[PDB]
């Protein structure tokens, strides 16, 4: 049961590492896409201002 | 150790679910900011075009 509970922790932790690494990749990509959106929008606003 | 391993199962699994929720929020924000980046770039393209 300790192996099952610890394995549930270890496997859910690996699950977590993959989806936390995914959250990190999605977070970095969303920040990049958000900064690029802010800039593409700021370019659009700058182009609208122009 | 089993109680702590079950608490770790809960924390690594709750972690995995909080991270899955965060990864989903960051994935949706990634997907929302890339779709809206493509739109913000098309607005920049339209803003530059107009």
Swiss-Prot record, chains A, B:
It comes from the Eukaryota. Disulfide bonds: none annotated. It is found in: Cytoplasm, Cytoskeleton. Induction: Induced in stimulated quiescent cells. Residues 5-25 are annotated as: Disordered. Belongs to the tropomyosin family. The molecule is in a coiled coil structure that is formed by 2 polypeptide chains. The sequence exhibits a prominent seven-residues periodicity. The sequences of cardiac and skeletal muscles are identical. Homodimer. Heterodimer of an alpha (TPM1, TPM3 or TPM4) and a beta (TPM2) chain. Interacts with HRG (via the HRR domain); the interaction contributes to the antiangiogenic properties of the histidine/proline-rich region (HRR) of HRG. Interacts (via N-terminus) with LMOD2 (via N-terminus) and TMOD1 (via N-terminus). Binds to actin filaments in muscle and non-muscle cells. Plays a central role, in association with the troponin complex, in the calcium dependent regulation of vertebrate striated muscle contraction. Smooth muscle contraction is regulated by interaction with caldesmon. In non-muscle cells is implicated in stabilizing cytoskeleton actin filaments. This is Tropomyosin alpha-1 chain. It comes from Mus musculus (Mouse). The gene is Tpm1. The chain holds residues 112 to 161 of 284 of the full protein.
